[PDB]
Amino acid sequence: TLPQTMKAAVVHAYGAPLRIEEVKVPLPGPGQVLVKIEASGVCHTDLHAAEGDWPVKPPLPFIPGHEGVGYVAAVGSGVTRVKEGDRVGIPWLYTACGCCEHCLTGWETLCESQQNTGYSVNGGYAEYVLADPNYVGILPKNVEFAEIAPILCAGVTVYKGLKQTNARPGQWVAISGIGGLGHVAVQYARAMGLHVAAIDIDDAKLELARKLGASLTVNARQEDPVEAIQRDIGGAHGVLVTAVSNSAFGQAIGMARRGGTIALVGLPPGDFPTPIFDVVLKGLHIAGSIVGTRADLQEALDFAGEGLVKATIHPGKLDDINQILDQMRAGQIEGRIVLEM
Amino acid sequence: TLPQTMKAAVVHAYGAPLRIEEVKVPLPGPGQVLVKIEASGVCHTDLHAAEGDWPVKPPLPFIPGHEGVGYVAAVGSGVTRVKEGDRVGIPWLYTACGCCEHCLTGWETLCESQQNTGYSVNGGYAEYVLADPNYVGILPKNVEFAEIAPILCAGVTVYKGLKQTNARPGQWVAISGIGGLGHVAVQYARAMGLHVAAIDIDDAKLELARKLGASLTVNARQEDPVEAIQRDIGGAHGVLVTAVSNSAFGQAIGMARRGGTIALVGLPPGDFPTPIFDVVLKGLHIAGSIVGTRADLQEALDFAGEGLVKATIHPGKLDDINQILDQMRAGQIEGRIVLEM
Amino acid sequence: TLPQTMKAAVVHAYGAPLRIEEVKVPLPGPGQVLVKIEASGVCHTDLHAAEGDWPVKPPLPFIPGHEGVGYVAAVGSGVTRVKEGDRVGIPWLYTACGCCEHCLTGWETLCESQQNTGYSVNGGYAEYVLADPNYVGILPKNVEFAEIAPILCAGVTVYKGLKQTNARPGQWVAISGIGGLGHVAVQYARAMGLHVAAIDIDDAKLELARKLGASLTVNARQEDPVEAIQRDIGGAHGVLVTAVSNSAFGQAIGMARRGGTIALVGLPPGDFPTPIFDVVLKGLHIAGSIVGTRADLQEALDFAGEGLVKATIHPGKLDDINQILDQMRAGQIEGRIVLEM
Amino acid sequence: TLPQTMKAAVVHAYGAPLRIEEVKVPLPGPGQVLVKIEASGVCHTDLHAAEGDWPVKPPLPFIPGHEGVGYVAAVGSGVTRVKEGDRVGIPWLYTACGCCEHCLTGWETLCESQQNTGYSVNGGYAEYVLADPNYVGILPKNVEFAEIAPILCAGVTVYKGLKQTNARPGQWVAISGIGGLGHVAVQYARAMGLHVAAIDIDDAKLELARKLGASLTVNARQEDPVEAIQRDIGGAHGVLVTAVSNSAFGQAIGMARRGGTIALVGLPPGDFPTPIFDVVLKGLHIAGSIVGTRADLQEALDFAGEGLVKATIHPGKLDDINQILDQMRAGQIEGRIVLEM
Ligand SMILES: NC(=O)c1ccc[n+]([C@@H]2O[C@H](COP(=O)([O-])OP(=O)(O)OC[C@H]3O[C@@H](n4cnc5c(N)ncnc54)[C@H](O)[C@@H]3O)[C@@H](O)[C@H]2O)c1
Ligand SMILES: NC(=O)c1ccc[n+]([C@@H]2O[C@H](COP(=O)([O-])OP(=O)(O)OC[C@H]3O[C@@H](n4cnc5c(N)ncnc54)[C@H](O)[C@@H]3O)[C@@H](O)[C@H]2O)c1
Ligand SMILES: NC(=O)c1ccc[n+]([C@@H]2O[C@H](COP(=O)([O-])OP(=O)(O)OC[C@H]3O[C@@H](n4cnc5c(N)ncnc54)[C@H](O)[C@@H]3O)[C@@H](O)[C@H]2O)c1
Ligand SMILES: NC(=O)c1ccc[n+]([C@@H]2O[C@H](COP(=O)([O-])OP(=O)(O)OC[C@H]3O[C@@H](n4cnc5c(N)ncnc54)[C@H](O)[C@@H]3O)[C@@H](O)[C@H]2O)c1
Ligand SMILES: [Zn+2]
Ligand SMILES: [Zn+2]
Ligand SMILES: [Zn+2]
Ligand SMILES: [Zn+2]
Ligand SMILES: [Zn+2]
Ligand SMILES: [Zn+2]
Ligand SMILES: [Zn+2]
Ligand SMILES: [Zn+2]
């Protein structure tokens, strides 16, 4: 029964490598539940969090991680949505007010009163996590913790981004960047009746793309994505930008078909110059997309449950976390790194 | 009995003054008609064309003008849509192929085989204009030439742009740039049940907006437009950028509410900045819109026929086109200047 | 402080006239609030409730009324959305689970776990009402209780139904039945940029329609609505069916323009024969619409607050309720009857 | 060198057997082409036409067939879209005006000035057919005549119907009637990422559906289809009714999930029942869909070109058309019977 104490990679300074330190096990107060983390995925956003890469930096000291999945250990008072033992996941969208303009219209994702797991509230880089039962993800029974962990963020984000491009079955989607989110985006696009064109700067990643269903591949370092896509398919109906690069964005605009949509999911910093003439005359749409809604999450989880999407995960230990992060900043990760516990 | 010769304003060199000269009156070939210009609107696009601001420039020399309105004076063989004496207008979209992806799906506007009146084909800065009967606008009988001229471009464009915004009745739309396009957008926006926030850089232009239905008025030369819209209404559900300013485009994006849509219609040369991080986290949509479809055009014209939209025009003479364009360069025009032949 | 006892028109038998009987004043338990009813509208659905007109009949004995508006008298424990004294309204949608397929996607209105005010839970035909703070309507400060009461049901229902027809500004909407919901539907349609065609079987009601903005009127008892609408406007883009009649439905289908949408809001019983050939070949859409979502309710309330919609209300006393109901079953009501208290 | 005479199956009286007779081979007038029929699909619409089941009947005598496929044999003057030797098909939508509300908005399908192949104009139950080059389907080069014939109607229709359903990848669609249209709808539905529940009245037809991708199979002659779909999947997000049965239409509506859409494509004569109360409370949408647009047709054909859809066909001879239609009357056809000239 509850260790009363757990280990967790905590962040005390922006840029200062985390430190595994046995800390207290939270207690499920009213409207809360405790989750024993079985697996926990490592998202690129975890780096941006402990690296104070964004305007609203994470209050220190925090525990990152929003791809934490496990069993409901304890149940706070009033909790109806989940019971003890339930296999659940705690995503980026920790909570939302539930009654504002966006929450009432199905866009809780844009709620200004939201909390974010592993950023403004402690996450899954620990053995236990406190979660809001109403925003937690109900996992499919037929998939192991290590496998669905990625869906908790890379999965929903990519799935929702694809919905945001509005590309219909039989059409093309150009996926810029086949990394953590990218290799899983190829699978969702596939399952959504879309022809996939994969763009990256590493042949290994491009190879994985073909294994996953991509019928067109382009190494942006060996050839121009823009004219390759425009020449071979006439422009993609939808474009999903995963790349964190600077040039990737401009090439995404250029790879788009007339009247097509470029869905932005990557979070690079700063303003990006965009061709006025091209966007207006070609009637291009640029859509910003953040993770997913609870409905999006459940839908994204269903695809995994149907076996239509399998994340390419590589195991990792909680203490080797710093090595793992440095590996992602260097882009030396092939797929998604899910922490075992 | 058709002059055989006519006066027209010609652009022979970029940046150079136009020259009023005598040119041969064209004869309607098989699928064409000759329109006798009665009124002709001056659009800022004519400035960009005469100045050679865009990536794709208008071959020289040429006669500008895509807000030309008048009577069908002669009909070529095989023409069926209109007949001699019909009151008709020749807009930016001169023709389209009629059988490509875009043309078949209600987006002839994105057709790659289109021609543009007063740019790639001669336009209305003349006494007569050749035209494709199939793309000409059919004018409402109760509105006078000079008054409906602006709807051939400023009206359709702005109307389709407001539709691309997806703002529904009761919602707010921030319109940046209250000129030829903008002053008419205020009217279409009101007729569409929207609350209007107008942004410009001249108090006289904001007063025109107020007179036309704008509830909130902001002068960007006196205060920060972004914090003004964000402070006074919390951001607009829809934003329509008409302004010939790259920075105005960046500010426009900052005027949107979470989940809002920014329709880009202005064509200043160069690039505009996309704050990816903000666009993503706020779930913003940016949409480039080009003039309007034939269906869009007739719908736009109907609003004018209903008296719901009335362009603010000022008469002009073909011989004074250089000083008129100078007046536009200096932003000294209230609404639109419409040439009368 | 709380009367501890209140009067209320209760229903003890389906068909057996209600009876005003001083009963206990409910106490706001956790997650609840008490509302002192200042005004309470009488909806046609109240008859269907005490007349066991529907499959799932109201548990007896109940207090009908879902257009009850007043002040928040008491606040249960945990309540955050509303404070004591707040002017609020309790609509048809009493509560919903908040985490099901429909609730997560913005359609709480279709929640199978919902409760309905004045049907499955006591309503506003009393001096006080227990409500769920999260589904109650936040009223606009500038409108008196007697006036916004109708919006709590007739308003939102009609507003949402109009949205469901998808008729865009500048287009036509045929409103079949200008009664409780109908006369307020003419105002919303008006405020939504729609041209209104009013259909009824009473000239008095049709007269009110013209006063409210209808530009086309038809007494279905004096002339055929179908050919009148088809001849005068070519078919309405949208049709909103308020009538409880049998023939009204078939005429609504016939009054629709090709590709148009007939939005059903009226709740007559039984199956209605529909022309297969006409619906298929004319690409007609039939949309069932129930009251509104919390977002729809707030949006509908905003129109009243802007003064764009004014319900035509007639005062009534709680004890004269039976007379009032018999008056509605006979169709002798001109507008909406709001109970004073 | 063009026979000058050809064999064709003619309908001279409703209900009476067709007569194979010699008729003059038409000559392409100005905007026409002559197509030499190589394969011709038998559609149930041909039965309704020969039987005179519809409100608007086909003038007698006439040659049915709107799934006629072949080579352009002769071109009239002014024809530009196709040229001699092109593999092309003549569908139900023979021509349209090209400039009305519907034609200009991507809905030429609803054009009031259209003509229908094998109904108001002679069709493919012959060796040659006159056609309007602008509405003919352009066949993929890698698919054989007999195999693509059904896409000219069964395929496009069913494909556009599934789109009208609005069911997105991962969702369920219940397809009622697995015949010519239905067996091909199962394939388009799968290619669109949908889970398929097939309903028919013959086990052999359900087995065909299973082989083509259906997950749930229901025989309406053995069990209540409605409670079966409602029990096994809780209702389908989308429903597509192909069945030549009025009651099947009522049952189809009962197969939808709350908020679901039922696309009506079948054309049995008479009316279908709309349970208004259920449609309203469940927020259901009923949509009538007619064949498909030229854009729809090319998209439908592309799926076939991609090998994602393959019609199950059986060869037939023009001389055996009466026995073939008898076979259809008795529901003894597996998929489609395609005549080979
Ligand atoms: N929108 C959201 O809700 C959300 C959720 C997931 C992560 N994040 C964002 O996702 C991004 C990282 O994705 P992962 O998928 O987490 O990261 P990753 O580092 O594993 O993958 C990025 C991929 O981009 C590719 N790439 C780099 N430059 C490129 C170029 N010029 N052209 C084409 N491809 C290029 C790399 O080769 C790599 O495979 C970050 O910007 C992060 O902040 C956002
Ligand atoms: N996308 C299309 O289909 C389309 C069709 C119409 C015209 N054009 C473009 O519309 C633009 C001009 O519109 P008109 O309506 O033709 O022009 P205009 O010159 O009459 O009006 C432009 C308005 O922008 C205002 N403005 C300038 N700088 C501003 C700033 N920083 N912030 C806010 N407002 C500012 C001016 O004061 C002026 O009122 C041109 O770029 C033209 O090419 C595009
Ligand atoms: N969908 C919902 O959420 C919802 C909410 C409001 C009320 N209800 C339904 O609204 C209906 C009653 O509306 P009110 O607006 O409450 O009722 P009402 O009785 O005041 O008005 C009905 C109107 O129908 C008109 N009418 C009757 N026969 C007609 C015909 N053949 N053609 C044209 N008009 C005809 C009458 O003259 C009358 O004005 C009921 O069916 C009720 O159950 C449904
Ligand atoms: N709306 C359109 O654009 C369009 C275009 C294609 C064909 N048509 C219509 O499609 C229908 C025929 O389709 P085919 O695909 O041409 O016909 P078909 O005869 O090959 O197939 C009809 C199928 O319906 C099944 N069926 C009969 N009764 C049923 C019931 N009660 N429940 C479930 N299934 C039942 C049959 O067993 C059969 O498999 C006709 O009404 C025809 O006119 C319409
Ligand atoms: Zn993440
Ligand atoms: Zn919120
Ligand atoms: Zn212009
Ligand atoms: Zn084209
Ligand atoms: Zn009601
Ligand atoms: Zn619910
Ligand atoms: Zn057919
Ligand atoms: Zn037409």
Q: What are phi and psi of B129, to 5 degrees?
A: -140, 135
Which residues of chain C approach chain D closer than 8 Å at the C-beta? Answer: 54-55, 102, 107, 109-110, 112, 249, 258-259, 264-290
Whether residue B248 contacts residue B266, with contact meaning beta carbons closer than 8 Å, is answered with yes
Tokens of C259: 């590709």
Rounded Cα distance, B43 and B110, in Å:
20
Q: Which atom of ligand 2 approaches the CA of B289 most closely?
A: 1
Which resolution, in Å, applies to this structure? 2.3
DSSP-derived 3-state class of residue C129: strand
Rounded Cα distance, A87 and A66, in Å:
15
How many CB pairs below 8 Å do chains A and B form together? Answer: 120
Pocket probe for ligand 2: among B244, B293, B337, B338, the residue whose CB has the most ligand atoms within 8 Å is B244
How many CB pairs below 8 Å do chains B and C form together? Answer: 25
CB contact under 8 A, A299 and D193: no
DSSP-derived 3-state class of residue A66: coil
Residue reference for tokens 């002014």: D78
Residues 6+ apart with CB under 8 A from B109: A283, B93, B96, B102, B160, B290, B291, B292, B293, B296
Rounded (10°) angle between helices C182-191 and C203-211 = 20
Cβ contacts (< 8 Å) between C266 and chain D: which residues? 276, 280
Q: Which chains neighbour A (Cβ–Cβ under 8 Å, 3 or more pairs)?
A: B, C, D
> Does the beta carbon of D242 lie inside 6 Å of ligand 4?
yes
Nearest to C105 among A81, A98, A295 (CB): A295
Rounded (10°) angle between helices B321-329 and B44-51 = 100
Could you tell me if residue A131 is left (phi over 0), alpha (psi between -120 and 50 degrees) or otherwise beta? Answer: beta
Q: State yes or no: D205 annotated in a binding site.
A: yes
What's the CA-to-centroid distance between D115 and ligand 11, angstroms? 14
Which alpha helices (DSSP H) does A233-283 contain, by range?
Answer: 247-255, 276-281
Cβ contacts (< 8 Å) between B169 and chain C: which residues? 169, 191-193
What's the CA-to-centroid distance between C118 and ligand 9, angstroms? 9
Partners of B121 in the beta sheet? B117
Pocket probe for ligand 2: among B42, B48, B181, the residue whose CB has the most ligand atoms within 8 Å is B181
Q: Whose CA is nearest to atom 1 of ligand 4?
A: D265
Partners of C35 in the beta sheet? C72, C129
Strands (E), C21-136: 23-24, 33-41, 68-75, 87-90, 93-95, 115-116, 128-131
What's the CA-to-centroid distance between B337 and ligand 2, angstroms? 14
Altogether, the residues listed in chain A come to a count of 341
The answer to whether domain B1-152+291-341 and domain B153-290 are alike in fold is no
Residue of B nearest to C300 (CA): B170
Rounded Cα distance, C88 and C138, in Å:
5
CB count in 10 Å sphere of residue C113: 13
Amino acid letter for position C303: F
Q: Render the burial of B75-88: b for 16+ CB within 10 Å, e for the rest.
A: bbeebebbeeebbb
* Annotated binding residues of B for Zn(2+): 43, 66, 97, 100, 103, 111, 153
Q: How far apart are the first and last CA of chain A?
A: 17
Closest ligand to C-alpha of residue A97 is 6
Strands (E), chain B: 5-10, 19-24, 33-41, 68-75, 87-90, 93-95, 115-116, 128-131, 137-138, 172-176, 195-200, 216-219, 236-241, 256-264, 271-275, 285-288, 313-316, 336-340
Residue reference for tokens 């250990």: A73
Q: CA nearest A94: which of A127, A58, A61?
A: A58
Nearest to D191 among A169, A299, A303 (CB): A169
Which residues of chain D approach chain A closer than 8 Å at the C-beta? Answer: 163, 168-170, 191-193, 299, 302-303, 306, 308
CB contact under 8 A, C280 and D272: no
Partners of C116 in the beta sheet? C93
Cβ contacts (< 8 Å) between D294 and chain B: which residues? 99, 104
Partners of A261 in the beta sheet? A238, A285
Q: Whose CA is nearest to atom 21 of ligand 3?
A: C179
Partners of A272 in the beta sheet? B274
Whether residue A131 contacts residue A33, with contact meaning beta carbons closer than 8 Å, is answered with yes
Whether residue C202 contacts residue C191, with contact meaning beta carbons closer than 8 Å, is answered with no
Helix and strand tally (H, E) in chain A? 10, 20
Partners of B264 in the beta sheet? B241, B288
CB count in 10 Å sphere of residue D141: 7
Rounded Cα distance, C314 and C308, in Å:
19
Tokens of C238: 């949208």
Q: CA nearest B94: which of B113, B74, B70?
A: B113
Q: Given the DSSP bridges, would you call strands C93-95 and C115-116 parallel, antiparallel or unpaired?
A: antiparallel
Whether residue C7 contacts residue C43, with contact meaning beta carbons closer than 8 Å, is answered with no
CB contact under 8 A, B109 and A283: yes
Tokens of C160: 């949402």
The domain segmentation of chain B, as residue ranges, is: 1-152+291-341, 153-290
Rounded Cα distance, B106 and C197, in Å:
28
Rounded Cα distance, D203 and D221, in Å:
10
Rounded Cα distance, B83 and B33, in Å:
9
Q: State yes or no: C60 annotated in a binding site.
A: no
Residues 6+ apart with CB under 8 A from D109: C283, D93, D96, D102, D160, D290, D291, D292, D293, D296
| CA-to-CA separations, B199 to A192, B158, B179, B251, in angstroms, rounded | 42, 15, 10, 10
Question: CB-based burial of residue D24 (10 Å sphere; 0-12 exposed, 13-18 middle, 19+ buried)?
Answer: exposed
Q: State yes or no: C66 annotated in a binding site.
A: yes
Residue of C nearest to B309 (CA): C170
Tokens of B283: 């779930």
Partners of D70 in the beta sheet? D37, D88
Q: Which atom of ligand 4 approaches the CA of D265 most closely?
A: 1
Q: Whose CA is nearest to atom 43 of ligand 4?
A: D45
Closest ligand to C-alpha of residue B327 is 2
Closest ligand to C-alpha of residue C181 is 3
Q: CA nearest C77: which of A30, B199, B155, A255?
A: A30
CB count in 10 Å sphere of residue D203: 12
Rounded Cα distance, C255 and C286, in Å:
13
Method: X-ray
Whether the CA torsion B318, B321, B327, B331 is positive or negative: it is positive
Pocket probe for ligand 2: among B40, B42, B43, the residue whose CB has the most ligand atoms within 8 Å is B43
**H-helix or E-strand spanning residue D232:** helix D225-233
CA C34 to mean position of chain CA atoms:
22
> Does the beta carbon of D179 lie inside 6 Å of ligand 4?
yes
Cβ contacts (< 8 Å) between D134 and chain B: which residues? 99
Domain B1-152+291-341: which CATH class? alpha beta
**C231-237: long-range contacts (C-beta < 8 A, 24 or more apart)?**
C232/C197, C233/C172, C233/C195, C233/C197, C233/C257, C235/C260, C236/C167, C236/C172, C236/C173, C236/C174, C236/C197, C236/C260, C237/C165, C237/C167, C237/C168, C237/C171, C237/C172, C237/C173, C237/C261
Pick the CATH number of B153-290 from 3.40.50.620, 3.30.200.20, 3.40.50.720, 3.90.1150.10: 3.40.50.720
Rounded Cα distance, B316 and B333, in Å:
11
Q: What is the DSSP letter of D78?
A: T
Residue reference for tokens 């194979």: D20
Question: CB-based burial of residue B211 (10 Å sphere; 0-12 exposed, 13-18 middle, 19+ buried)?
Answer: exposed
Whether residue B127 contacts residue B36, with contact meaning beta carbons closer than 8 Å, is answered with yes
Rounded Cα distance, B172 and D100, in Å:
32
Residues 6+ apart with CB under 8 A from B211: none
Q: Which atom of ligand 4 approaches the CA of D292 most closely?
A: 3
Whether residue D216 contacts residue D80, with contact meaning beta carbons closer than 8 Å, is answered with no
Q: In this structure, what is the dihedral angle of CA atoms A29, A31, A34, A38, given to the nearest 10 degrees? A: -160
What's the CA-to-centroid distance between D107 and ligand 12, angstroms? 8
User: Concatenated DSSP letters for A285-315?
Assistant: EEEE--S--HHHHHHHHHHHHTTS----EEE
Whether the CA torsion C291, C295, C296, C302 is positive or negative: it is positive
Residue of B nearest to D293 (CA): B104
Q: CA nearest D172: which of A190, A158, A299?
A: A299
Amino acid letter for position B213: G
Tokens of D296: 């729809």
Q: On the CB side of B314, how many CA atoms lie within 13 Å of its CA?
A: 15
CB count in 10 Å sphere of residue D119: 24
Q: CA nearest C62: which of C121, C20, C129?
A: C121
Cβ contacts (< 8 Å) between B271 and chain A: which residues? 273-276
Cβ contacts (< 8 Å) between D98 and chain B: which residues? 98
Rounded Cα distance, B53 and A5, in Å:
67
Question: CB-based burial of residue C222 (10 Å sphere; 0-12 exposed, 13-18 middle, 19+ buried)?
Answer: exposed
Rounded Cα distance, B252 and B240, in Å:
8
Strands (E), chain D: 5-10, 19-24, 33-41, 68-75, 87-90, 93-95, 115-116, 128-131, 137-138, 172-176, 195-200, 216-219, 236-241, 256-264, 271-275, 285-288, 313-316, 336-340
Q: Which chains neighbour B (Cβ–Cβ under 8 Å, 3 or more pairs)?
A: A, C, D
| CA-to-CA separations, D39 to A185, B232, D116, D144, in angstroms, rounded | 42, 67, 19, 9
Cβ contacts (< 8 Å) between C193 and chain B: which residues? 169, 191-193
Q: State yes or no: A99 annotated in a binding site.
A: no
Rounded Cα distance, D36 and D341, in Å:
9
| CA-to-CA separations, C138 to C108, C141, C297, C302, in angstroms, rounded | 17, 9, 9, 10
Rounded Cα distance, D289 and D286, in Å:
10
Q: CA nearest D172: which of D158, D154, D192?
A: D192
CB count in 10 Å sphere of residue A22: 11
Q: State yes or no: A267 annotated in a binding site.
A: yes
Rounded (10°) angle between helices A154-165 and A294-305 = 110
Nearest to C110 among D246, D258, D266 (CB): D258
Pocket probe for ligand 1: among A44, A205, A262, the residue whose CB has the most ligand atoms within 8 Å is A44
Whether residue B340 contacts residue B146, with contact meaning beta carbons closer than 8 Å, is answered with yes
Rounded Cα distance, A68 and A145, in Å:
9
Amino acid letter for position A134: N
